[PDB]
Subunit: 114 residues, 2 copies
């Protein structure tokens, strides 16, 4: 059973599955799947698992297609890492879930180095 | 007084306060305070001065947390240097302020090139009890 580590940005995270290989760096292309849940009524607000192809991002490069936290938090993950994240509202949906942290679990599927 | 020095990227800067110690190099972790203003009407668009702990960046490594110009212009600054900067749109807000330069003043509060940034106080103590 693992503690959370807190980023400067206010994300709490821990790795539920360590994964293996070289850790993702800023600028890497990363294919991911994830789900996010409310912490007040525990409901799934978003799950990508039903997309054929996993969505891809560039690590550390916010491009408005996912919550801000995800672009940051993939850094340091490896292929098959599963990272559980307690996400503060300013990095998720400050206009839809303004008051509560959201709980995300993110799976890295594939990494293409920059 | 002094002229602006222009970088290749178009940052025009002068040091208002020289600073002390070794110059900042790419990759150094730097705590900075800054404010930026429009030159059309000189209103403040951003100020860090309400943050008791100043934002920190790695010199020369844009991470999208601050305007691009900042990561470049810390290089060669020192602890306590204050640099006044005329910044071109491509390095600031290329959509929001596409048509004017912006005026920034950046102060370097602390440089950590150290990795001497080990743990302190109760954290340090509890860490050591966790080797042994
Ligand atoms: Cl799991
Ligand atoms: Cl929102
Ligand atoms: Cl809420």
């Amino acid at each position: 059973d693992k503690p959370y580590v807190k980023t400067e940005s206010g994300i709490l995270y821990k790795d539920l599955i360590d994964g293996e290989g070289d850790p993702i760096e800023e600028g890497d292309i990363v294919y991911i799947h994830y789900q996010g849940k409310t912490t007040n009524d525990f409901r799934i607000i978003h799950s990508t698992f039903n997309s054929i192809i996993p969505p891809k991002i560039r690590a550390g490069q916010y491009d408005q297609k996912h919550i801000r936290a995800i672009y940051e938090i993939v850094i340091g993950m490896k292929k098959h890492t599963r990272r559980q994240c307690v996400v503060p509202p300013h990095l998720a949906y400050p206009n839809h879930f303004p008051s509560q942290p959201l709980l995300y679990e993110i799976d890295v599927v594939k990494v293409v180095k920059k």
